[PDB]
Amino acid sequence: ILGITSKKIENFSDWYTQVIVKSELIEYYDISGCYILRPAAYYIWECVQAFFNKEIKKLNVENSYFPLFVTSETIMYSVFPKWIRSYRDLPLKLNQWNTVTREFLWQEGHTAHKNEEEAVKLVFDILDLYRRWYEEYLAVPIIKGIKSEGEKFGGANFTSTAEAFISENGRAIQAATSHYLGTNFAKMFKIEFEDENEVKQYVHQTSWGCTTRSIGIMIMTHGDDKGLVLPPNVSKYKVVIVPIFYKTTDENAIHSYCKDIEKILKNAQINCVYDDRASYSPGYKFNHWELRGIPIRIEVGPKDLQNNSCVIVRRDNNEKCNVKKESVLLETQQMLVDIHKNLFLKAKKKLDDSIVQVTSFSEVMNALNKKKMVLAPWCEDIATEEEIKKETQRLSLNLSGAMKPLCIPLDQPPMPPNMKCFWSGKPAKRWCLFGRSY
Ligand SMILES: COc1ccc(Cl)cc1C(=O)NCCc1ccc(S(=O)(=O)NC(=O)NC2CCCCC2)cc1
Ligand SMILES: [Cl-]
C-alpha cells in the first residue's frame, strides 16, 4: 500500500495519480480536483524557469507582469501602440511568468518585430529553447513541427509546436507552442511604426508558451512501477545514502562512514540526504526514496567498511556497482550524467519506434492498433482533417479513438515529385504526423 499498486501499462490512469501523490509532488486540497504543488514539484519548475530565463535574456527578452486577463488571454496588444512609434522602439520583447486537468503555472512570451524574417527567426529560436528545456532538463525527446490549418491558433499566421508521445497509451501530447502572429493583431489595434525610410509599417508579432504540463510529460515518460523517476537536473537530492546494519555492530562506524560520503558530495555542491532514521529498515528506505525519484542510492554496510567501498544503485535501471570510497565523488558525477543520457536515449528510442511511415490510408489502422503514430504524405486540405478523424474513429470503434494531425515535422523525409496524398489521392504537399492525442 506504501508503494505503487497499479502497473503503468495495465492501468495508466490510476498509476499516474498514485505516482504524483505518493512521490509527494502534489497534494489534493479537496474533491474539486484542485491540488497543491509541493516543493518536489515546484523545484522542477524552478529549474526549468532558471534555464529559460537565462536563455531568453540572451535574446534581449525582458520579464514583466500584466495582471489583467479576459476569458483565457492577457490584455496586452491594445497597449502596444503606446510603446511603439518608430523602428528604434523595435523589437519589443516581453515575457511573463504566470500563476492561475487544469494547469497552475506557466510562461508566456510576446514579441513585436519590424519585419517577417526577424519575427519568424525568433519563433524558431524559442521553439528550440523549448526543445532544450525538455531534453537537457526533463530528458524528454520532442518533435518540432508546424500545426495544420485546422489545429493552429486562430489568430496565428502559423503555429509551430513541440510534440511529445506517451508510448504506453499510444497518445501524443502538445508540449509547447511558438506562434508567428504576422500582422493580424497589428491591424486590429493599429500597432504601427515608421521604418528607416519614414514609412508606416505593421509590426510582426510572435507569442510562445509552455506550462507545468512539461512536468507531467516528464513523469509519464520516465516513471515506472516503482514510482517517480527524476532526471538529476530537476531533483533536489541527487543522492540518498542508506546505512545497512546487521545488528552485529558497529552502527557508529557505519554512521561515521556515511557522514564522510555525505560531506564529500555536499562539499562538491552535490545535494544529498543521509537517511539515518533508526526506526526503518534499509529495505523500507530503498522503496521510500525510489518512490520519490532520487537518481542515485549509495548503500553502506559492514563489507563496505572492510573494503573501503560503497554500493551505488542507479534509479533508472537498478544496476549496482562497487565503488572505492576515494572514487565516489567522480563516479557519482559521471553516473548522474549517464543516468540523464540513458533516460533520454531510451525515451527517444520509444519515440522513434512509435512513428510508422506510410504512403496509404490502408496502412493506418495497423499502426493505430499497435499504439503508434503515422507519418504520411498529405494534401493538407482542411476538410480532410475531420474526414480522417471520423473514419479512424469509425474503424476503431473506440478518450477519443480518432487520429488528428499532430504536426508537419520541421525534419521532412524526401518527397517524391509524383507522391499522392495518402487520403484523397490528390498530390501530396508535405509529410504530416498523425496520431491519437490528449
Ligand atoms: C483521461 O485519463 C486517462 C484515461 C485512460 C488512460 Cl489509458 C490514460 C488516461 C490519462 O490521461 N492519465 C494521465 C492523466 C493526466 C496526465 C497528464 C496531464 S497534464 O496535461 O500533462 N498536466 C500535468 O501534468 N500537471 C502536472 C501534474 C504533476 C505536478 C505538476 C503539474 C493531465 C492528466
Ligand atoms: Cl489587448
Side-chain angles (χ1 to χ4, degrees), residues 3-6 8-28 33-53 55-84 86-99 103-195 197 199-246 249-262 264-302 304-370 372-389 391-397 400-438:
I4 312 294
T5 61
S6 297
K8 184 179 179 179
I9 297 180
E10 306 183 357
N11 191 358
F12 191 84
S13 180
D14 183 46
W15 167 86
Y16 182 69
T17 45
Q18 290 198 28
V19 167
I20 60 185
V21 168
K22 297 184 174 181
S23 66
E24 301 185 326
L25 287 168
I26 66 157
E27 186 74 63
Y28 286 106
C34 180
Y35 60 96
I36 296 167
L37 291 178
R38 305 191 64 180
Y42 197 88
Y43 184 84
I44 302 168
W45 186 248
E46 254 190 309
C47 289
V48 298
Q49 193 175 26
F51 163 74
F52 194 65
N53 269 329
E55 292 300 324
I56 63 178
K57 279 170 190 172
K58 292 178 183 174
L59 303 172
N60 302 321
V61 180
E62 296 183 319
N63 285 329
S64 59
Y65 189 71
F66 297 59
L68 191 53
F69 290 68
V70 61
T71 303
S72 167
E73 270 287 354
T74 312
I75 293 191
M76 181 179 308
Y77 293 167
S78 63
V79 181
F80 281 7
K82 300 167 170 180
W83 295 341
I84 298 169
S86 80
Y87 66 100
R88 294 183 296 265
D89 300 324
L90 298 174
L92 177 67
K93 298 176 170 180
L94 297 167
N95 181 68
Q96 298 88 42
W97 291 97
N98 288 313
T99 77
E103 227 61 56
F104 290 144
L105 316 181
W106 82 96
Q107 163 276 326
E108 187 179 326
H110 304 259
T111 66
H113 305 256
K114 69 180 177 180
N115 59 38
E116 175 174 352
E117 179 174 358
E118 187 184 289
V120 167
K121 176 182 171 42
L122 188 138
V123 165
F124 290 119
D125 281 340
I126 291 301
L127 188 62
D128 196 52
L129 290 183
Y130 287 149
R131 194 265 312 169
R132 292 179 58 198
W133 169 328
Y134 277 89
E135 168 173 345
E136 302 182 5
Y137 290 85
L138 304 181
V140 175
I142 54 92
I143 299 177
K144 303 201 283 191
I146 309 297
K147 288 290 185 185
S148 63
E149 287 304 297
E151 293 285 330
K152 70 162 190 176
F153 169 62
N157 179 278
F158 68 80
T159 294
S160 80
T161 178
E163 296 286 325
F165 185 77
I166 315 299
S167 52
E168 282 75 3
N169 57 14
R171 294 194 178 271
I173 178 171
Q174 179 182 291
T177 43
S178 185
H179 313 277
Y180 170 57
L181 305 179
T183 62
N184 295 332
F185 293 99
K187 298 172 179 178
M188 183 179 184
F189 300 109
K190 288 174 290 182
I191 320 180
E192 305 162 353
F193 75 96
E194 302 188 27
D195 54 29
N197 303 324
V199 180
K200 282 292 196 301
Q201 305 287 350
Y202 275 137
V203 301
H204 290 255
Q205 290 177 253
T206 81
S207 66
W208 23 275
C210 185
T211 77
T212 33
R213 165 182 285 185
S214 56
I215 301 180
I217 292 176
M218 179 216 71
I219 296 163
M220 291 187 293
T221 302
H222 302 310
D224 57 29
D225 290 335
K226 290 181 182 180
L228 189 60
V229 175
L230 290 169
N233 279 337
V234 296
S235 182
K236 187 186 68 166
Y237 295 124
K238 319 298 179 185
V239 180
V240 55
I241 304 173
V242 178
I244 300 179
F245 317 100
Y246 282 155
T249 230
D250 189 15
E251 299 181 1
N252 179 77
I254 297 289
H255 186 53
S256 185
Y257 193 88
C258 290
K259 259 119 97 291
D260 295 337
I261 296 177
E262 179 184 23
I264 283 300
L265 296 181
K266 281 182 178 175
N267 287 344
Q269 312 312 313
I270 298 176
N271 205 8
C272 57
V273 51
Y274 169 39
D275 195 344
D276 59 348
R277 297 177 292 172
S279 302
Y280 303 100
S281 74
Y284 177 101
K285 296 174 182 174
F286 296 169
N287 303 335
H288 183 270
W289 297 108
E290 280 172 353
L291 185 66
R292 282 156 178 79
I294 308 302
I296 290 178
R297 172 170 75 254
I298 295 181
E299 304 174 1
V300 171
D304 298 294
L305 294 185
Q306 177 179 292
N307 298 334
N308 200 61
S309 63
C310 62
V311 177
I312 294 188
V313 187
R314 309 172 52 138
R315 173 64 177 93
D316 57 348
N317 59 19
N318 201 41
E319 287 182 349
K320 315 188 177 194
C321 60
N322 299 325
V323 175
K324 303 181 300 300
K325 194 194 182 186
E326 69 273 16
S327 294
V328 175
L329 173 53
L330 177 54
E331 293 205 24
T332 291
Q333 290 170 326
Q334 295 174 345
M335 190 72 74
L336 292 171
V337 170
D338 193 76
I339 288 173
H340 182 96
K341 179 192 175 186
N342 181 65
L343 287 176
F344 180 77
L345 285 183
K346 92 186 203 292
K348 199 202 186 331
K349 175 173 177 48
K350 291 158 73 183
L351 175 61
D352 295 343
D353 291 344
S354 294
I355 300 170
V356 183
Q357 185 168 335
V358 310
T359 54
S360 181
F361 185 79
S362 63
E363 304 168 273
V364 168
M365 292 316 294
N366 166 72
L368 294 188
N369 292 339
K370 288 167 181 166
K372 295 182 183 302
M373 297 174 285
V374 305
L375 182 67
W378 187 36
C379 69
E380 302 190 20
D381 291 345
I382 193 171
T384 65
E385 298 194 20
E386 204 62 30
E387 298 176 4
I388 290 166
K389 287 182 183 182
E391 180 65 7
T392 55
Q393 176 65 270
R394 172 191 159 257
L395 291 176
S396 59
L397 304 169
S400 180
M403 83 173 188
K404 60 156 61 181
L406 306 177
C407 75
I408 295 153
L410 301 191
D411 183 26
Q412 291 275 306
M415 180 69 82
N418 217 30
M419 179 66 69
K420 307 305 180 180
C421 170
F422 82 124
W423 174 257
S424 63
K426 302 171 62 178
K429 286 184 178 54
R430 298 172 294 192
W431 293 87
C432 187
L433 200 62
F434 293 82
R436 301 200 172 106
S437 186
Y438 281 95

